[PDB]
Amino acid sequence: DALRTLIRLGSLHTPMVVRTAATLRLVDHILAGARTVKALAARTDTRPEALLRLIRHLVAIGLLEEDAPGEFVPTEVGELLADDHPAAQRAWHDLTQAVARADISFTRLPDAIRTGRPTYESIYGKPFYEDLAGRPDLRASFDSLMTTREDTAFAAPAAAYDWTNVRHVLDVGGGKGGFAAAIARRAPHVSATVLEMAGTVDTARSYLKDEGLSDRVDVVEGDFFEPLPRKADAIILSFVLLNWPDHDAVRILTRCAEALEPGGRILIHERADVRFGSTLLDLRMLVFLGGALRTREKWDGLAASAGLVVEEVRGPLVSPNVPLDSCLLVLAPA
Amino acid sequence: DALRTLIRLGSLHTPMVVRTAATLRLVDHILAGARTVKALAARTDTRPEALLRLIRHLVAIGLLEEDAPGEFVPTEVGELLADDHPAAQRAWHDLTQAVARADISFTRLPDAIRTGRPTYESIYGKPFYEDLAGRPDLRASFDSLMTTREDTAFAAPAAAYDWTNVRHVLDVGGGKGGFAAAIARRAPHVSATVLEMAGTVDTARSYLKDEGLSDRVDVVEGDFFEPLPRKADAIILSFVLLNWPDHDAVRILTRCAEALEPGGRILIHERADVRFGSTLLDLRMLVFLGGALRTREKWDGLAASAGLVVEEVRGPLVSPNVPLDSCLLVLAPA
Ligand SMILES: CC[C@@]1(O)C[C@H](O)c2c(cc3c(c2O)C(=O)c2c(OC)cccc2C3=O)[C@H]1C(=O)OC
Numbered sequence: 001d002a003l004r005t006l007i008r009l010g011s012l013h014t015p016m017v018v019r020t021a022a023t024l025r026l027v028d029h030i031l032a033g034a035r036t037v038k039a040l041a042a043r044t045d046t047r048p049e050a051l052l053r054l055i056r057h058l059v060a061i062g063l064l065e066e067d068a069p070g071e072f073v074p075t076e077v078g079e080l081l082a083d084d085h086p087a088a089q090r091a092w093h094d095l096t097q098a099v100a101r102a103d104i105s106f107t108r109l110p111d112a113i114r115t116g117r118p119t120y121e122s123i124y125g126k127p128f129y130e131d132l133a134g135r136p137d138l139r140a141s142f143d144s145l146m147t148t149r150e151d152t153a154f155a156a157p158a159a160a161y162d163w164t165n166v167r168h169v170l171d172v173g174g175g176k177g178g179f180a181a182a183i184a185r186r187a188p189h190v191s192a193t194v195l196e197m198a199g200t201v202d203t204a205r206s207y208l209k210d211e212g213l214s215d216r217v218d219v220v221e222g223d224f225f226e227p228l229p230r231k232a233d234a235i236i237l238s239f240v241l242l243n244w245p246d247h248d249a250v251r252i253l254t255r256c257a258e259a260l261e262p263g264g265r266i267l268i269h270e271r272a273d274v275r276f277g278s279t280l281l282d283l284r285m286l287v288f289l290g291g292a293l294r295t296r297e298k299w300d301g302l303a304a305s306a307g308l309v310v311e312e313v314r315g316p317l318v319s320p321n322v323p324l325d326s327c328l329l330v331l332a333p334a
Numbered sequence: 335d336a337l338r339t340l341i342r343l344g345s346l347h348t349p350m351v352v353r354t355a356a357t358l359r360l361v362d363h364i365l366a367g368a369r370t371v372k373a374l375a376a377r378t379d380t381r382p383e384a385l386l387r388l389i390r391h392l393v394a395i396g397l398l399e400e401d402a403p404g405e406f407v408p409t410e411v412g413e414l415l416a417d418d419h420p421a422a423q424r425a426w427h428d429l430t431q432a433v434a435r436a437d438i439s440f441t442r443l444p445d446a447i448r449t450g451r452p453t454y455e456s457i458y459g460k461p462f463y464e465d466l467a468g469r470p471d472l473r474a475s476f477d478s479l480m481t482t483r484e485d486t487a488f489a490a491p492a493a494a495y496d497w498t499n500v501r502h503v504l505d506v507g508g509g510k511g512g513f514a515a516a517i518a519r520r521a522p523h524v525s526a527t528v529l530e531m532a533g534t535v536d537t538a539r540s541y542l543k544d545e546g547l548s549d550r551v552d553v554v555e556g557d558f559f560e561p562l563p564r565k566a567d568a569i570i571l572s573f574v575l576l577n578w579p580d581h582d583a584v585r586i587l588t589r590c591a592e593a594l595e596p597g598g599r600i601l602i603h604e605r606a607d608v609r610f611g612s613t614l615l616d617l618r619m620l621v622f623l624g625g626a627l628r629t630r631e632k633w634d635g636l637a638a639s640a641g642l643v644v645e646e647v648r649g650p651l652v653s654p655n656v657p658l659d660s661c662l663l664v665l666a667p668a
């Protein structure tokens with residue numbers, strides 16, 4: 001009992017079997033009509049004997065079941081590996097896309113606990129975002145994964161703040177601009193600017209065009225460790241600061257403080273440290289990037305170092321469906 | 335629900351957190367009196383902030399619990415990570431010992447499914463047993479791990495066969511000689527020979543000496559792909575053949591057939607393919623070694639190729655305590 005529990009918790013084969021199934025698009029091939037192990041093997045370009053041994057573990061953990069002899073089909077849980085499922089778990093487990101690939105850094109977790117430093121570079125040759133800057137496929141899949149974290153498409157954070165006195169929003173590291181878009185739909189008088197890295201700026205521009213928002217949201221390529229491209233009344237850091245150790249996060253916050261208009265505020269949208277998934281995201285930040293999730297008291301110190309104070313934390317954001325784990329910290333000049 | 339289930343099954347951070355805790359000997363340090371995170375950090379030579387983030391996940395998965403503020407203790411499941419626990423799970427999860435280290439091969443499982451070939455060499459530079467031959471620390475921990483698979487110390491397989499008409503036993507790849515020892519205690523008239531690799535032969539010799547069996551069990555250093563050192567009435571292959579692809583297993587079986595006395599038998603002691611843990615061991619063999627677990631029908635073909643027939647399979651072996659997953663196949667000249 002206790003022995004079986006410990007063995008399952010410590011098992012490396014099971015998560016790699018799940019990720020291999022996702023990378024091979026196994027459930028998609030089954031749902032597209034691959035009824036036999038020979039057809040599945042052919043569509044995935046794998047050895048049939050080896051694929052069957054993978055399938056045997058997929059059956060044992062309840063992702064596949066045998067309907068007829070030799071005919072394997074997804075269970076209710078396996079169906080979440082279909083590529084069009086809205087939770088996007090296939091892509092989140094795909095070893096050729098940015099996050100599951102980055103998760104290999106966990107194989108060197110002892111080094112990260114001994115040093116406090118990320119292990120991603122020791123495995124892939126460059127730190128996380130520099131590796132993405134050299135790999136257009138990983139840059140693109142990362143940006144797409146970041147748009148599948150929550151089901152409101154930033155509607156819930158955009159609704160948690162009053163935009164009446166805001167004329168311009170600067171979305172610092174704003175990904176493909178989904179947050180800037182949600183504010184624009186919410187608040188017709190606001191204009192916005194997204195500051196992002198090379199590669200990402202082009203998909204942000206295409207996304208904002210296709211929303212019909214090109215006239216209201218601009219995109220600037222740049223580095224948020226440098227002086228920001230313009231001033232704004234609200235400056236958004238959405239899942240940015242957790243990517244960075246304290247001294248780097250203070251540098252970013254300081255650049256934002258310097259770009260605030262009088263009366264402006266900085267909005268940090270992030271999962272706060274205090275259930276489910278908190279330790280996964282925190283340890284991801286450690287081994288990918290050297291970042292961390294932060295408590296309120298930790299945020300107080302970071303803000304003070306940047307000439308700011310935490311005015312308000314708008315607690316875990318609500319959706320009609322699956323709850324957002326994230327919060328909105330509102331920061332003002334000290 | 336289904337989403338949380340899939341996310342837990344696909345999680346790489348949880349098994350690496352367990353293995354990191356085992357490698358750091360975290361539970362041993364707690365039980366030896368490390369009551370604070372600062373004391374634990376000092377004994378494990380880790381950063382206190384990073385160690386706490388590891389501990390937070392260890393609490394979330396139920397291996398540790400907080401007794402007093404800042405004082406972490408093993409749960410009933412965490413206690414199995416104590417190094418002296420008889421299930422030996424600490425060593426089985428220790429990333430500096432041979433098996434948990436080998437499990438990193440699972441990070442390249444897609445390659446193994448595409449090619450049918452093991453991934454261990456692509457990661458560590460040499461195939462499994464050649465890597466052990468160059469690493470005395472891994473050779474030794476592997477040999478020790480192989481003595482902790484079952485709780486009877488080979489008493490159950492030794493009791494599953496009638497030794498009356500056996501005068502000499504050859505234990506081919508017999509590890510530290512634990513199986514030869516169990517037969518010797520069971521059957522006072524039998525002498526035995528263990529055939530093993532360099533390094534392992536010395537710990538076999540020390541173990542057999544310390545059992546008081548040096549006069550009854552010899553150890554020979556050699557290669558079981560070469561002609562065997564002598565003939566015997568029973569030739570044991572205990573958790574050997576699953577290490578090898580079919581053609582290599584046939585070579586071994588053939589060497590054994592050539593060394594059988596008239597009326598002799600070959601005993602294969604292995605987990606047969608047909609619950610819990612079957613797919614783990616099978617996929618381990620794939621990615622470590624290119625081996626596999628085999629069904630009865632597969633064994634029939636291998637035996638026939640070696641000039642043998644399966645006479646009898648003595649089904650899953652029984653213990654008074656935790657059941658042995660293994661079986662004993664009895665093979666005779668065709
Ligand atoms: C179901 C929750 C969630 O889908 C969304 C959660 O927000 C979240 C996840 C993963 C990542 C991030 C997340 O925010 C990142 O912010 C992130 C990052 O920061 C910009 C830089 C690199 C990688 C990641 C990352 O892999 C997922 C999770 O399971 O974690 C518990």
Ligand SMILES: CC[C@@]1(O)C[C@H](O)c2c(cc3c(c2O)C(=O)c2c(OC)cccc2C3=O)[C@H]1C(=O)OC
Pocket residue numbers: 433482483484573574576577605610611612614615618622
């Ligand atoms: C609780 C079961 C068990 O403790 C014992 C089970 O017999 C078993 C295990 C691990 C290994 C082997 C086992 O036989 C090997 O034979 C082996 C091997 O073969 C000689 C060569 C390299 C690695 C291994 C190996 O890691 C464990 C397990 O959990 O697997 C489901």
Ligand SMILES: Nc1ncnc2c1ncn2[C@@H]1O[C@H](CSCC[C@H](N)C(=O)O)[C@@H](O)[C@H]1O
Pocket residue numbers: 129146147172173174175176179195196197200222223224225237238239240243
């Ligand atoms: N120096 C830098 N300058 C500008 N953006 C950077 C940067 N370093 C990292 N980033 C960006 O920071 C982002 C963090 S991922 C978060 C994206 C988006 N805000 C969201 O909530 O979904 C990435 O898109 C990355 O491109």
Ligand SMILES: Nc1ncnc2c1ncn2[C@@H]1O[C@H](CSCC[C@H](N)C(=O)O)[C@@H](O)[C@H]1O
Pocket residue numbers: 463480481506507508509510513529530531534556557558559571572573574577
């Ligand atoms: N070419 C070879 N010649 C002899 N032994 C070999 C060998 N290749 C691998 N081995 C041995 O095969 C063993 C398989 S592990 C099984 C050990 C033991 N029979 C038990 O049941 O516990 C290892 O000890 C390894 O040293």
